[PDB]
RNA sequence: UCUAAGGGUCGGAACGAUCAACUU
RNA sequence: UUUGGUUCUAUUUUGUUGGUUUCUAGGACCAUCGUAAUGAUUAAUAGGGACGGUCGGGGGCAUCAGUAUUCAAUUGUCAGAGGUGAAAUUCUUGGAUUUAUUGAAGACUAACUACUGCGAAAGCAUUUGCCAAGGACGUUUUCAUUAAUCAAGAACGAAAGUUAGGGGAUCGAAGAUGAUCAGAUACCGUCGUAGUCUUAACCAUAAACUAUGCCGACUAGGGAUCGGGUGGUGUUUUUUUAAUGACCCACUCGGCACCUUACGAGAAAUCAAAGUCUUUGGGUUCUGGGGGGAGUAUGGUCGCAAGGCUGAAACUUAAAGGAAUUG
RNA sequence: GGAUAGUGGCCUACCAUGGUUUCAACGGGUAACGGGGAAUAAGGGUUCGAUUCCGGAGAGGGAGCCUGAGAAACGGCUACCA
């Protein structure tokens, strides 16, 4: 938890910085192959040993975010051409 | 199967004694060994582990939450996973007080572990 | 078995308390009250 | 252990010890099953064999 | 969910319509037994002739007054200060009465076990 | 039933290879009838996998999906990903394809 | 000034063979 | 009945004492042989599950469709377009108001739609598909007592309302102004915040209704719209034809949602129960005890908040209140 | 094991975690002495209890004692508080 950040700065803040916090570490899937062993060295970065390979990890959560849509939308246009 | 031990009724008859003989019937049949004969074959096999009337509730009820686990929004799916559940439990007891050990099974990895063969 | 309910209750502690056939006490003031609706008069009472 | 199988090594020696024993005894009375395949199967084959040595007729002829 | 008033509340539930009685619960040594004390003192007709799963033994023709309703009751005490009192259930002292008690010995009637000074449970009460 | 349903009968008869090396042996040795190679399983460990038996004598139905799951398929749960069903069963591995 | 607890290497629930200490 | 199965306890005599191992049976123990209809209530118009048929605006998730709304780019021209009781505020030689191609955005699912289908309940109407469910039916399939209602505890719970981000068409709290009034902080315009949608998380209230607890009985008639039985007849599939098939008609039953009239119930109204029982009676969960003071005071808990949940007493009044009938 | 006139955690020590509870523990309240029995009962019940008789407990509060067969005493002491 926070409290890490001890009783100092209020609440709402802690809250948030906990939201992104528990999320700042421990992923959790194979963007290559194997098991849960990636993360996010800082920001952008996020490599994984069960391959020993780095993925372009999102921010405070190496999970792309809006690239959900992109996941679709992007590769989705790949539909046309060639269906 | 044993629930379907009587898919015999379909093409053999007659529910089913034979395994005793009371309000009996009228057709060929070669007695207890006519039953047993292929009645033992039946499920291409046998069983007994424990215990059908649950080995089914726990199943439908088991896969029953795969969706729950992924979907997770079909709250109108929890509202039953509770019920197929409270059921899967309600059984136990009449075995937790009789047929199945005295804890596990009668408690089992229930909630949860896809069991078991 | 079960079940106790309302109406008249045990806890008491009012203002004469002794359910007294009176209550002795000195005559603080002479406040002649005043009648309520319908009827009407100077209802001479005492505090 | 990595939790607290202990509280003073005399006690790992303990549970290891006792435990082991008790378990060994549990097999030492699960042998009962042996008792109950023997003292029953004996009279299974003995009810068959007694059904044979009390009605051995068509056994000398048959076909 | 309670074989007693179940069926006595069908005889009861019947003769008030007026008729020739009908089916009932399933049988019960007790059902049949009241559906005896009844006949044996009068009121009902002839306990009847079914036989099924437990549905066996009887239907049972009506006949007569039998007014009104067999008594079902759902407690059970008895004897001396008792019986006489729960004889307040009755439709009036001067005869009439009949309180089909359960008597330690015998499923008996207000008097039928007033008999050999008996007592016990209070199974019911007729007319 | 489906292949994700055929391999469940498979794990009751037949010859579960369980491997990725022992997979290679299964093949080269000479026994690997099919070959169940998961999607996850890296390219080379797939293209050379291929080559191995496409050399030997066997047909290989590229797997369904998850490796971590492709095992739960064949019970284990230990994320297998390249089986070599070696012996017959009560399944249509002779009709896995057309 | 006493009592008790808590250890390492060699040999079969073993004993102690032996070795060394803080501390509660 | 039977050393083979051991294993005791101490009695009787041996003179007395004690200690012995012989018995010697008397328990319990595993075996062995022999006896005997040699051991298992029914299959609840109770409940669970099997199965196969299917139905449904049931649930999740994707994705389709549509018209419009308001808005744009370019339009055609040309003098008013609003807007109600009647006006006004405004828009307007800025190209509005009225059409002209096209696309843009989020709501929303018209019409058919009813006599209603489905859901625990709230609530559920575009397309296709994937995901797991559900009753009723059909058999006696499989079990055999597993059940019935429940203080505790919990899962879902409309709308507003909170948290954070996405957008943001429409309408639209607050807020403005325009009329209207003696007075208008409104009701009638018109802008417009929030909100309305959304995702992860809270909130747990509602005229949350059918103002009617759950389970099982029994008590009486007809009609009409969902699964199963038969005669099938009615018109067409299947076609050169029959038949079958599809709808479809008639008699049944099941269970559904509902309607129309006796005994019996009620204060009435009304009630297929709100029925049965003098005035017990089938089993249970729950709440009420004149109005107010009040769902307030205090306490504890829940919550971010708004609030929820629990919840008094003092005092104060004799009426408040249902239904009916007439003015 | 120590005490007791004598059981027993009665008290000591040493050792073990136990014993109660929604079938209501625990805690709070009593303008609470209990039971005889009292009052108004169609019945079913409400309500009452320190006048007598039983059993208890106390002589201002509170301990501790000598006396003895018998008392933690009232019409006996001892100290404290009053």
From Swiss-Prot, chain B:
Cross-linked residues, Glycyl lysine isopeptide (Lys-Gly) (interchain with G-Cter in ubiquitin): 5, 9
Gene Ontology biological process terms, A to Z: cytoplasmic translation; maturation of SSU-rRNA from tricistronic rRNA transcript (SSU-rRNA, 5.8S rRNA, LSU-rRNA)
Gene Ontology CC terms: 90S preribosome; cytoplasm; cytosol; cytosolic small ribosomal subunit; nucleolus
Main location: cytoplasm
Domain of life (superkingdom): Eukaryota
Subcellular location: Cytoplasm
UniProt keywords, alphabetically: Cytoplasm, Isopeptide bond, Phosphoprotein, Ribonucleoprotein, Ribosomal protein, Ubl conjugation
GO MF terms, alphabetically ordered: small ribosomal subunit rRNA binding; structural constituent of ribosome
Sequence similarity: Belongs to the universal ribosomal protein uS15 family.
Function: Component of the ribosome, a large ribonucleoprotein complex responsible for the synthesis of proteins in the cell. The small ribosomal subunit (SSU) binds messenger RNAs (mRNAs) and translates the encoded message by selecting cognate aminoacyl-transfer RNA (tRNA) molecules. The large subunit (LSU) contains the ribosomal catalytic site termed the peptidyl transferase center (PTC), which catalyzes the formation of peptide bonds, thereby polymerizing the amino acids delivered by tRNAs into a polypeptide chain.
Protein name: Small ribosomal subunit protein uS15
Origin species: Saccharomyces cerevisiae (strain ATCC 204508 / S288c) (Baker's yeast)
Swiss-Prot record, chain C:
Known role: Component of the ribosome, a large ribonucleoprotein complex responsible for the synthesis of proteins in the cell. The small ribosomal subunit (SSU) binds messenger RNAs (mRNAs) and translates the encoded message by selecting cognate aminoacyl-transfer RNA (tRNA) molecules. The large subunit (LSU) contains the ribosomal catalytic site termed the peptidyl transferase center (PTC), which catalyzes the formation of peptide bonds, thereby polymerizing the amino acids delivered by tRNAs into a polypeptide chain.
Comment field (misc): Present with 10600 molecules/cell in log phase SD medium.
Protein family (similarity comment): Belongs to the universal ribosomal protein uS12 family.
Entry-annotated residues carrying 3,4-dihydroxyproline: 38
Post-translational modification note: Hydroxylation at Pro-38 affects translation termination efficiency. The stereochemistry of the 3,4-dihydroxyproline has not yet been determined.
Glycyl lysine isopeptide (Lys-Gly) (interchain with G-Cter in ubiquitin) cross-link, chain position(s): 30
Subunit-structure text: Component of the small ribosomal subunit (SSU). Mature yeast ribosomes consist of a small (40S) and a large (60S) subunit. The 40S small subunit contains 1 molecule of ribosomal RNA (18S rRNA) and 33 different proteins (encoded by 57 genes). The large 60S subunit contains 3 rRNA molecules (25S, 5.8S and 5S rRNA) and 46 different proteins (encoded by 81 genes).
Positions spanned in the full protein: 27 to 73 of 145
Protein name: Small ribosomal subunit protein uS12A
Subcellular location: Cytoplasm
UniProtKB/Swiss-Prot annotation, chain D:
Cross-link (Glycyl lysine isopeptide (Lys-Gly) (interchain with G-Cter in ubiquitin)): 20, 60
Cellular location(s): Cytoplasm
Region (Disordered): 38-63
Subunit structure: Component of the large ribosomal subunit (LSU). Mature yeast ribosomes consist of a small (40S) and a large (60S) subunit. The 40S small subunit contains 1 molecule of ribosomal RNA (18S rRNA) and 33 different proteins (encoded by 57 genes). The large 60S subunit contains 3 rRNA molecules (25S, 5.8S and 5S rRNA) and 46 different proteins (encoded by 81 genes). eL19 lies in close proximity to the binding site for eukaryotic initiation factor eIF4G.
Function summary: Component of the ribosome, a large ribonucleoprotein complex responsible for the synthesis of proteins in the cell. The small ribosomal subunit (SSU) binds messenger RNAs (mRNAs) and translates the encoded message by selecting cognate aminoacyl-transfer RNA (tRNA) molecules. The large subunit (LSU) contains the ribosomal catalytic site termed the peptidyl transferase center (PTC), which catalyzes the formation of peptide bonds, thereby polymerizing the amino acids delivered by tRNAs into a polypeptide chain.
Family of the protein in this entry: Belongs to the eukaryotic ribosomal protein eL19 family.
Additional facts recorded: Present with 97700 molecules/cell in log phase SD medium. There are 2 genes for eL19 in yeast.
Protein name per UniProt: Large ribosomal subunit protein eL19A
Encoding gene, per UniProt annotation: RPL19A
Residues of the whole record sequence present: 127 to 189 of 189
From Swiss-Prot, chain F:
Gene Ontology molecular functions: pre-mRNA 5'-splice site binding; RNA binding; structural constituent of ribosome
Subcellular location: Cytoplasm
Protein's GO biological process: cytoplasmic translation; negative regulation of mRNA splicing, via spliceosome; rRNA processing
Note, other: Present with 59300 molecules/cell in log phase SD medium.
Keywords: Cytoplasm, Isopeptide bond, Ribonucleoprotein, Ribosomal protein, Ubl conjugation
Organism phylogeny: Eukaryota, Fungi, Dikarya, Ascomycota, Saccharomycotina
UniProt keyword Ubl conjugation present: yes
Protein name stated in the entry: Large ribosomal subunit protein eL30
Residues in cross-link Glycyl lysine isopeptide (Lys-Gly) (interchain with G-Cter in ubiquitin): 15, 46, 76
A GO term from the CC aspect: cytosol
